[PDB]
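agent: user wants the full assembly modeled, not chains individually. Plan: 1) parse entity lines 2) check alphabet per entity 3) run joint structure prediction 4) return tokens. Steps 1-2 passed, three entities, 569 residues total. Proceeding.
--- entities ---
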Amino acid sequence: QSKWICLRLNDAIIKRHVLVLSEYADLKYLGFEKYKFFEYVIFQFCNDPQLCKIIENNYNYCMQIFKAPADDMRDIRHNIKRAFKTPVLGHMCVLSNKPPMYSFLKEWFLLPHYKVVSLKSESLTWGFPHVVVFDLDSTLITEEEQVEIRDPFVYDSLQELHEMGCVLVLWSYGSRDHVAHSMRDVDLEGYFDIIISEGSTVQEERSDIVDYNLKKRFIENKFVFDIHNHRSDNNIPKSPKIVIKYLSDKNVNFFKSITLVDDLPTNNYAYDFYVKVKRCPTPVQDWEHYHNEIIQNIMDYEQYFIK
Amino acid sequence: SLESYETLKIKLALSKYMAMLSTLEMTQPLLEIFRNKADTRQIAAVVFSTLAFIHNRFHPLVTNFTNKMEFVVTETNDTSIPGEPILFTENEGVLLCSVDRPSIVKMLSREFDTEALVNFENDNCNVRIAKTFGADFSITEVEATQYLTLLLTVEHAYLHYYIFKNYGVFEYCKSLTDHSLFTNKLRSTMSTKTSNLLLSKFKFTIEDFD
Amino acid sequence: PQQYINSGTEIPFCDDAEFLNRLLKHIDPYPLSRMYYNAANTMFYTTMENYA
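--- prediction returned ---
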């Protein structure tokens, strides 16, 4: 629960990317010119009013002041998109000069600043992309072990979504094996963008190849996850870390908004939108209302603010 | 670099030293004076001002200084000694320091190399072409080189002086015979500000070859 | 001695920090992180010469 402040760089020499500071003095860690890399930069509100006064006297950059008691990633994003009237925001830079312990945002991509040069743009969409992420084992499939397409209308809706550029990101928690069968069984991949498996579990991380099935080009479902929280509970959230990682692997570096669609609300750590799939032992053809919901969710920013 | 801003801090200390001598009674660029015998008193006074800045930054906790001391400069290799282009002396209470101009002048005649040698930020529109769109102060790297060179040379002398003052004549002789006390020693009382001292900044070795 | 800094009576100082900073700016790109070696080279050279 804190007041907050943000730089807005005057000359957007690099766009969209934003940073978070532990010190007003961190400018010294940044040195010359590199501030021109970061369109906006958030800092916790000054305790001493003289700091804010000197800031107010500085003309080198624009700035904003606000409250964000809501210590949440997506809520902060929403607030900032309001403040600067911008639908999209870049990645958050980090340094070995360790960030302020705003670790409530822990689960996120962190850019070690120098990768800024590594920031290629990408072809993959001519519009700014929306993204939707999915699961197999109990998400949208029929509950029969031989799953069925709930609706061929959905089957073609898959391709239709390309009209809007909605990117389609399956992460089955189930092993690669059932996906290996599913692929041959139904060319949803022929309608569908990105696939991942093995998400079921988290491993006790501590400091102490699949192509052969049919000559595929598919990912090593590597052990990229970590304990991350090391606490007495049993949650396997969908991971923006891995997700964005794969996105930048696809050179996907920006997005409008991302929705998770799954049967498990718990994994949603404040995703933009969550679609609790209605588990079904029949092809329900319920997709019509799911469509409508998602469309309205998209429209939310037609007003320039999600609400 | 995570040290890069500290290298900039070193640049800052350097410029702080430079501007004071560049403004206070700064008649001419160094070589114009040093090529001539004119106002050897001015030359020695500039040296003393350098020593003052050194006492300052090395031991800033107390700015007071025993400015009362004598000066000599020489033009005679029969007086000169290799390796110590400046030397302190005491004569029956007559504290004095002595120099040979020609040695240091001849020293400061080779700063003509160029850094066109090693890696830097990669050629890119970000590096340049980005600037191609949208958005007496006369100093050059060679002069800065020479000035830092002279500073570094005087550092040796100042450390020698400190030691001599604190330990008397015999230990001065001992150190001149053997500068090993210089050898790899940051360890100090905080008053020395030893990290301020540029020995911390650069390291070198010869290899005996063939 | 032809001179006597007993004539000296000062602790010379300057703090035109902003002027020094503007002057610093145009010297920022210089890679003394490379150049510095020149001084040591020439000093060692001269000392070698003097011993010879």
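agent: reporting back. Residues 114 and 142 of chain B are 9 Å apart (CA to CA). The longest helix of chain B spans residues 141-167.
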